[PDB]
Amino acid sequence: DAEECDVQADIIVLFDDSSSIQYDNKENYQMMKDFVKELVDSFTTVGVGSQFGVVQFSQGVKTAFPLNKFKTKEDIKKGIQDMVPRNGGQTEIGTGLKHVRENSFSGAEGGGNPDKQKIVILMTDGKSNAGAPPQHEAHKLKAEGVTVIAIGIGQGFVKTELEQIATMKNYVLTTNSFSELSTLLKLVIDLACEVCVVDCAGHADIAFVFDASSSINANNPNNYQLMKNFMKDIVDRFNKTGPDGTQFAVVTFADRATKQFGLKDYSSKADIKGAIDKVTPSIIGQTAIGDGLENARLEVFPNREVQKVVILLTDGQNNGHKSPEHESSLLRKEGVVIVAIGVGTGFLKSELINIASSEEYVFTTSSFDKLSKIMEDVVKLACMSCKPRAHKK
Template sequence: MSRTMRTYMLLATLAADSKAKLCGNIADIVFVIDSSSSIWEPYFKQQLQFVQQMVKTFDVSQKKTRIGAINFSNRVVREFHLKTHDSKERVLSAISEVEYTAGDSTNTNEALMVLRTEYFTERSGDRSDVPNIAILLTDGESTLMAETVKEANLNKETGLSMFAIGIGHNVNEEELTLIASAPKADFMYILKNVTELQTEAFTQLISHKACKILKNDTNEEKCTRIVDMVFVIDSSRSIWINYFKQQLEFVKHLVSAFDVGQGKTRIGAINFSDRHMTEFHLNSFDSKEDILNAVSNVQYTAGGTTNTFDALRLLRTEAFSAVNGDRSDIPNIAILLTDGESSNMASTVKEAKLTREAGVTIFGIGIGDKINKEELEQIASSPTSDHMHILESFTELQAGDFVKRIIDVTCKGKELYLHG
């Protein structure tokens, strides 16, 4: 089922009960509004009407929910900051005065940089003890996708919840997926046209999702179980760079679910293709923030072959060793991500067996239609129903239900995880 079809189904579900209750929870919310020339001026004004309808669903004031707005195309217009207006009426009036710039490019990356460095700052009215939410509206793809994804990731790493709403047939779904927070089913939407953006049902849908964030209903329960966990990440050239980055987003989401520290859960990472490298060891970092930054900095190598066996050997002989931070009394877990089959199945199966016999529980996650199911079954620990997963796409890797399933299984305290 496509993202667009899921959105339509949600709209249909909400249509019967579209009268919203006012969200009384508190947040700092910034709207990021596309004003490029590909959007006709009447459609731009419909975006503003959607923003106004959204604002009406919140209890707006400086002591409650604060609202800011950014207008972007080839340049970024700082419409108003979180501290600028102290009432809903003034915010609504300011939105009605936002002007259509008709810029000849879509510099989404610059808008997201301004969002992070200027808007969600104490100087501009951001509050450290209040959830940060951004709602991005666009009708196409950015001029510089790589920079846009980079800036989106930097925003999300600060704890920002990012809604990405694409309108029309020129939207780049892959880019929108990388911009949005996880789970994507809650934060990424593609609409057929601006008319759908203006439906009361869609306004209530986004308001409802945002209000759930305010109540912290979308945060997974943190896993307090202590493990030594190493991620083994496929970087072969069969994976496009943007899909590689989606792997990193998945890794960061899992890391965020654990209580990380040298006296708690430790995290390591290996990157492999025709060559293999340790990105960081279990004892490299002391904090979750440092680990998340390190994951963001993992480089795509685009190697010509997939030497999974070398990565598994490195996992067993170096990553899970005392000198590199492995603890003999703590369960060892490896999460291997790949989009195909290894260059040498016999050697890969052999190394996987040796790794499991050393007490490492291996999760084998295959993405796409090039996966060798037989090989993945022989890599993963038993039962394969828990430890082997084949996904249709990298977008599915970001799905909230899948991420939660992996978190739930890794957080179980089963005897099979213990090693000697």
């Protein structure tokens, strides 16, 4: 039966009106409209309050209507129906995103109330082939507490680009044709009804997946101890540890991967911190990032509803044995949020981006003694939990 969302929210739909849409098919725009109308119906609070706005983008940007124009569902659907696609000769996804933050959520247009979720739903049939670069504008949008969902129709977009734009890679949805948009209705709602929150008092399963290569202590023999203190300091940021709170695990990887201890092994901070201290590095100069992630997936997370998180750290590039992008995908698909940290000059930032849940969850630092400069931003993510709030009827 039907999907509903009771969450109070200011919701902006970024609506592609490029020439490409009209050309492919005469009835494409209408299916787009019908899709948005169903989104409007799926939100209980709309017209009691929860609001809705639409911004057209392609060549330049045009606001169809702001949050504070239509105070009831049916009036919003009319506004959507009365929309006139300008059929633009280019596609400016960054320009569209820029408009949405500066204007769409402004007090003038009906936003600025921190009591409501800010949601943006992007629909495009292609790649941002003009105007500002998307990622940057997206970065700032999201920084302001805005959830960005991105929908791609057809083949002329690049899923890569939608993954940079969206909150997380799994906030990107794709469909072959406009005829099939409706098949994304449920998923879009589920995603929009997520209430993301930073709370270190909440329950979580956190796996450290750390490099154990010999290369770490090469330039300085206290580096591995610095890594270990980084972990210890993270454990101490959580209110309560153990089965009734936040559990912890540690997996190291050098040439292969080794589970040092699992989630259910200890319950107190001091027991977990001491367990971390027990951990030693290897004599091998290899970084099997892939094995590390594999181990976490097979040995750690099945052996404990709570938020699963992996914190990955490496000072080198992957050796080869196992595919980090494949193991990470499977973890991501199981609901594991992944944070990637790189230290030094021997890792590949491109690998970290591919494994992390979002480029925004990737951190770098020149040395291990500079690690505490990212403690906060990493803890912020580790303490983050997103709860689904969509149901039926």
